[PDB]
Amino acid sequence: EDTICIGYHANNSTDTVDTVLEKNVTVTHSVNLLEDSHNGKLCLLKGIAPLQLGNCSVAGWILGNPECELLISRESWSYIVEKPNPENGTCYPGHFADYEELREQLSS
Amino acid sequence: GLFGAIAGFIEGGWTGMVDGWYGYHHQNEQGSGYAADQKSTQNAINGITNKVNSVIEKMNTQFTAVGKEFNKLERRMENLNKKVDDGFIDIWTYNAELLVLLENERTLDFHDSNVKNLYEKVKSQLKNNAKEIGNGCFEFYHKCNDECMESVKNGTYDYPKYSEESKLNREKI
Amino acid sequence: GLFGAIAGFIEGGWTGMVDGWYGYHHQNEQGSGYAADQKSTQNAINGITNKVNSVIEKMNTQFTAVGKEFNKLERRMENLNKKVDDGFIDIWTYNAELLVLLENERTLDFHDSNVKNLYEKVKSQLKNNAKEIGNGCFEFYHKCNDECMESVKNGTYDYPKYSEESKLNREKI
Amino acid sequence: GLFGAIAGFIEGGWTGMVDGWYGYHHQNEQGSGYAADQKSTQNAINGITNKVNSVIEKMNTQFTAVGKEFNKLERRMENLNKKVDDGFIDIWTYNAELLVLLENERTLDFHDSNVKNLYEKVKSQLKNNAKEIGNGCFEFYHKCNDECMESVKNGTYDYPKYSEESKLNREKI
Amino acid sequence: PMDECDAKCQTPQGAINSSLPFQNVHPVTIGECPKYVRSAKLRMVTGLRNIPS
Ligand SMILES: *[C@@H]1O[C@H](CO)[C@@H](O[C@@H]2O[C@H](CO)[C@@H](O[C@@H]3O[C@H](CO)[C@@H](O)[C@H](O)[C@@H]3O)[C@H](O)[C@H]2NC(C)=O)[C@H](O)[C@H]1NC(C)=O
Ligand SMILES: *[C@@H]1O[C@H](CO)[C@@H](O[C@@H]2O[C@H](CO)[C@@H](O)[C@H](O)[C@H]2NC(C)=O)[C@H](O)[C@H]1NC(C)=O
Ligand SMILES: *[C@@H]1O[C@H](CO)[C@@H](O)[C@H](O)[C@H]1NC(C)=O
Ligand SMILES: *[C@@H]1O[C@H](CO)[C@@H](O)[C@H](O)[C@H]1NC(C)=O
Ligand SMILES: *[C@@H]1O[C@H](CO)[C@@H](O)[C@H](O)[C@H]1NC(C)=O
Numbered sequence: 126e127d128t129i130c131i132g133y134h135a136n137n138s139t140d141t142v143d144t145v146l147e148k149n150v151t152v153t154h155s156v157n158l159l160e161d162s163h164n165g166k167l168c169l170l171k172g173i174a175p176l177q178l179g180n181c182s183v184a185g186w187i188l189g190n191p192e193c194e195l196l197i198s199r200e201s202w203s204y205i206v207e208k209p210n211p212e213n214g215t216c217y218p219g220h221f222a223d224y225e226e227l228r229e230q231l232s233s
Numbered sequence: 234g235l236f237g238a239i240a241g242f243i244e245g246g247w248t249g250m251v252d253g254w255y256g257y258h259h260q261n262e263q264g265s266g267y268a269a270d271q272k273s274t275q276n277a278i279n280g281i282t283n284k285v286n287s288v289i290e291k292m293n294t295q296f297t298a299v300g301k302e303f304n305k306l307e308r309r310m311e312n313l314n315k316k317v318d319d320g321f322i323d324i325w326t327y328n329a330e331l332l333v334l335l336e337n338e339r340t341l342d343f344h345d346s347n348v349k350n351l352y353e354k355v356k357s358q359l360k361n362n363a364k365e366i367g368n369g370c371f372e373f374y375h376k377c378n379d380e381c382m383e384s385v386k387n388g389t390y391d392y393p394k395y396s397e398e399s400k401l402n403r404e405k406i
Numbered sequence: 407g408l409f410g411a412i413a414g415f416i417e418g419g420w421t422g423m424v425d426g427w428y429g430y431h432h433q434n435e436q437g438s439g440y441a442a443d444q445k446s447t448q449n450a451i452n453g454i455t456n457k458v459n460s461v462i463e464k465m466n467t468q469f470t471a472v473g474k475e476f477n478k479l480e481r482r483m484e485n486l487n488k489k490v491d492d493g494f495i496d497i498w499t500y501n502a503e504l505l506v507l508l509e510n511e512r513t514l515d516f517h518d519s520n521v522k523n524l525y526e527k528v529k530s531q532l533k534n535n536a537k538e539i540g541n542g543c544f545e546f547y548h549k550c551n552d553e554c555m556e557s558v559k560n561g562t563y564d565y566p567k568y569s570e571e572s573k574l575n576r577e578k579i
Numbered sequence: 580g581l582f583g584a585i586a587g588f589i590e591g592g593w594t595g596m597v598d599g600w601y602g603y604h605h606q607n608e609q610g611s612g613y614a615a616d617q618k619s620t621q622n623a624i625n626g627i628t629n630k631v632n633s634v635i636e637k638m639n640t641q642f643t644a645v646g647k648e649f650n651k652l653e654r655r656m657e658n659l660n661k662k663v664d665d666g667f668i669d670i671w672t673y674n675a676e677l678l679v680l681l682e683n684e685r686t687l688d689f690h691d692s693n694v695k696n697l698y699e700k701v702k703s704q705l706k707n708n709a710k711e712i713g714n715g716c717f718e719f720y721h722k723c724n725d726e727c728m729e730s731v732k733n734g735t736y737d738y739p740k741y742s743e744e745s746k747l748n749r750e751k752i
Numbered sequence: 753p754m755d756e757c758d759a760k761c762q763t764p765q766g767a768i769n770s771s772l773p774f775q776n777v778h779p780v781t782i783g784e785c786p787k788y789v790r791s792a793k794l795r796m797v798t799g800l801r802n803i804p805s
């Protein structure tokens with residue numbers, strides 16, 4: 126004879142969490158909060174390009190080292206790019222005090 | 234099955250139905266089938282929408298610049314800025330990890346609650362007219378068509394309809 | 407109605423009674439009226455008292471001095487102290503906002519729970535003597551005075567009292 | 580008794596049994612005794628194990644050096660490092676204190692839930708065969724041996740077994 | 753490397769999708785950014801458990 130029953134959803138899915146009371150706990154639907162990924166690129170903000178030093182130091186940029194392209198057209202920009210180990214420091218050395226403070230002032 | 238159903242009195246899930254996370258299964262003479270509970274399902278899902286809007290938005294993400302760098306006569310400040318950043322980093326980490334744990338726990342409980350409430354809704358109509366069976370289901374002492382299914386979904390039965398058929402077909406048992 | 411009552415099997419609230427957040431409505435021959443459940447109400451409210459004492463007090467507010475100010479050869483420290491303070495500010499902000507959300511959710515659940523428990527208390531006495539009706543209420547197969555009301559509030563019925571009147575007035579139905 | 584049992588419909592605890600946090604008390608002709616519910620007990624306790632592993636481990640404790648010290652021309656940095664450390668200290672303090680409160684609340688609720696679920700399991704078998712009594716217990720309209728106890732623990736009754744003895748010994752009442 | 757593409761927050765390991773709240777990727781950022789953790793993964797449940805039988 127007839128019957129009524131409850132019902133609810135399952136699926137083929139096997140995506141998981143960790144949880145207080147059980148681990149690798151399987152569910153139907155999920156959502157990753159995280160952005161674990163990076164595109165491996167140096168894109169630009171907004172349509173505003175960043176400043177590129179290429180090989181230069183900040184010293185080589187600011188002072189006018191001729192193998193640092195001066196780039197006066199670059200009037201304001203998204204952000205500064207360096208490498209970690211910048212080639213072109215100053216062609217005539219000398220102590221360059223308050224490197225920190227100038228950099229923070231030229232953060233933005 | 235915190236509140237008694239899912240791995241509770243109910244054992245396992247059903248892959249047949251996909252239009253919505255809850256529903257009923259109808260079994261009568263025309264046949265069998267699954268049919269989802271869009272009312273409470275959609276209300277719940279509106280709740281979840283409000284959750285994640287109220288988790289993402291509660292951040293405020295500045296136009297930020299993270300980094301600094303220093304000489305070696307500033308080591309006060311170097312080990313500071315390390316301690317600072319690692320402190321904050323760990324705090325957001327710890328709060329957020331607990332938050333995902335707790336919110337998912339309450340999310341399971343939210344689901345559990347809605348299904349159990351619905352089990353009491355279904356039971357609320359058919360009290361003496363039809364019986365508990367096993368787990369997950371109720372057997373009728375009468376017969377039910379697709380109209381009876383659709384009516385019983387939306388919180389309507391007309392108790393006197395199959396009152397007497399229940400009052401007799403009980404009485405062999 | 408997380409647990410099944412308020413916007414659950416119960417639909418809506420009542421503005422008549424104000425002496426306490428819970429109660430009963432008595433309906434018998436002398437008339438009608440509302441009367442509050444000071445026992446469980448007062449216990450709950452003691453719970454809420456303990457809550458807010460345990461939210462306010464968990465701060466410790468120092469004899470504090472917030473502000474600093476600097477020249478322009480300290481910009482390390484300026485953008486630091488900005489980053490520092492904004493960091494802490496956001497952390498208290500985020501924790502507290504989540505805290506108000508969660509604590510209010512559990513507060514609604516606390517209320518929901520107490521009313522549902524009481525619904526099971528009321529049901530626990532009058533099991534076969536008197537019936538579920540509709541939502542929110544029970545109908546008796548017998549008659550009940552103000553003594554029966556006050557007794558049934560404090561967890562006392564004397565099951566054999568109207569046992570047989572129920573055992574007969576059922577039996578037309 | 581958030582969900583209705585412990586200081587709910589149940590009043591108080593029992594010191595007799597110690598092998599596990601839950602169980603039953605058997606009362607039949609051979610005598611009386613207490614016997615623990617190792618299944619759901621052990622599952623719960625596995626849950627608690629996972630909790631505290633997921634509270635302790637969520638820290639990461641560096642090979643740390645806390646302290647600094649300074650002259651008196653650095654008072655920017657002195658009152659800073661004070662403000663910094665006291666800030667972080669208070670944040671861990673506040674989060675952890677709330678965490679112990681909430682986690683213990685949910686722990687009581689976890690216990691409450693498991694016992695209530697079990698009360699519905701026990702009830703799920705013996706529905707018409709045997710009755711609710713008082714609080715905490717069910718009385719049979721038939722008789723039950725140690726085999727009936729051990730069977731009824733593991734979710735087995737054979738409903739037709741004492742169906743008819745219940746169907747008759749009810750009927751004097 | 754460097755490229756014409758656009759973003760809303762940025763770090764050396766890559767330009768970054770500013771949709772979501774968090775990374776575990778790299779602390780240094782510029783822009784309208786996520787926030788860093790030391791973690792592997794963080795995934796809220798939308799749905800619920802999966803058991804066929
Ligand atoms: C910008 O950076 C480039 C790359 O580092 C500099 O060129 C390199 O400079 C080094 C300096 O030691 C050169 O080595 C030297 O070569 C000369 C002979 O020319 C020799 O006298 C030294 O004893 C030493 O071996 C290196 O060859 C050179 N490489 C290239 C490809 O140029 C460049 O000088 C920098 N320019 C400015 C304006 O900063
Ligand atoms: C940055 O530094 C690299 C050094 O690796 C430069 O590479 C040289 O490029 C020229 C051609 O332009 C070659 O003839 C050299 O042999 C390269 N040297 C090396 C070591 O690879 C590169 O040109 C520099 N870029 C700028 C903009 O200064
Ligand atoms: C599970 O089903 C979904 C939707 O049909 C599909 O995207 C996914 O690849 C499936 N996975 C497997 C292992 O079948
Ligand atoms: C999840 O962890 C439990 C721990 O015992 C284990 O039994 C189960 O196989 C694990 N599942 C996966 C998919 O890792
Ligand atoms: C409920 O269902 C019945 C038939 O099953 C239908 O006639 C009625 O209009 C429905 N009511 C609502 C409020 O949806």
Ligand SMILES: *[C@@H]1O[C@H](CO)[C@@H](O)[C@H](O)[C@H]1NC(C)=O
Pocket residue numbers: 552553554555556557558560562
């Ligand atoms: C309960 O109510 C009855 C009358 O309704 C009264 O006589 C009795 O004293 C009350 N008991 C308690 C413990 O309040």
Ligand SMILES: *[C@@H]1O[C@H](CO)[C@@H](O)[C@H](O)[C@H]1NC(C)=O
Pocket residue numbers: 725726727728729730731733735
């Ligand atoms: C349940 O208990 C009965 C006796 O009480 C026993 O014979 C049976 O093997 C048990 N089943 C399980 C699955 O433990």
Ligand SMILES: *[C@@H]1O[C@H](CO)[C@@H](O)[C@H](O)[C@H]1NC(C)=O
Pocket residue numbers: 769770771
């Ligand atoms: C950025 O993330 C959002 C949400 O995950 C997605 O809709 C969008 O396609 C993503 N874009 C890129 C370029 O990754």
